[PDB]
Amino acid sequence: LTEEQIAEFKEAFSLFDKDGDGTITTKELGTVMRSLGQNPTEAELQDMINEVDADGNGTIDFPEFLTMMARKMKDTDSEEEIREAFRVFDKDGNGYISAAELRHVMTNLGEKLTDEEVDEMIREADIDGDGQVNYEEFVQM
Amino acid sequence: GSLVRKAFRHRLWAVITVQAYARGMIARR
Ligand SMILES: [Ca+2]
Ligand SMILES: [Ca+2]
Ligand SMILES: [Ca+2]
Ligand SMILES: [Ca+2]
């Protein structure tokens, strides 16, 4: 329960709270998850909403989200989360992250980056110079 | 019923991880 974790939890919560009301509905949780390549059913979305909503008001506020995310923490530098992060960036599933893919993901996180900025990120990471980023280069990044 | 708890965390940690690398990529460049 460090300050770093709290900041990361807050940034995740703001991304999901698409209208800024301080809560996360079922449709918000759906919409953000699919923007990042996940394919949850409406059945699991309602279930995740009911599990985390403690007071039963039908939505998830930040303390409720915080209670949930504070237990059983995984690690963003773990190869398990690195693997799951590669699934997001490599959207078409060919095993290489392209600039349009990085552009599309950055767009879904709320970043307004020009195409030159994105191309620089690819270059700074592209070791073999093939113009894309594979798993090895993604990890070393 | 704690499978749902597990799945929420897993889905969320992927988002947190993605955000962390997007921030870090912006941080390098
Ligand atoms: Ca909301
Ligand atoms: Ca609630
Ligand atoms: Ca790809
Ligand atoms: Ca490459």
N-terminal to C-terminal alpha carbon distance within chain B: 43
Residues B29/A117, Cβ–Cβ less than 8 Å: yes
Q: How many domains in chain B? A: 1
Distance between CA A87 and CA A112 in Å, rounded? Answer: 22
Q: Do strands A60-61 and A23-24 pair parallel, antiparallel, or not at all (unpaired)?
A: antiparallel
Chain B residue with CA closest to A90: the answer is: B18
Among B18, B16, B24, residue whose Cα is nearest residue A66: B16
Within 8 A of B24 by CB-CB distance, chain A residues are 141
Does A137 show up as a binding residue in the annotation?
A: yes
Residue corresponding to tokens 């007071």? A55
Q: What is the DSSP string of B1-29?
A: --HHHHHHHHHHHHHHHHHHHHHHHHHH-
Q: Which structural domain range is residue B11 located in?
A: 1-29
A interface test, pick of B2, B5, B18, B26 with most A CB neighbours within 10 Å: B18
Residues A108/A36, Cβ–Cβ less than 8 Å: yes
Distance (angstroms) between ligand 2 centre and the Cα of A109 equals 24
Side chain identity, residue A130? D
N-terminal to C-terminal alpha carbon distance within chain A: 26
Does A61 show up as a binding residue in the annotation?
A: no
Domain ranges of chain A: 2-74, 75-141
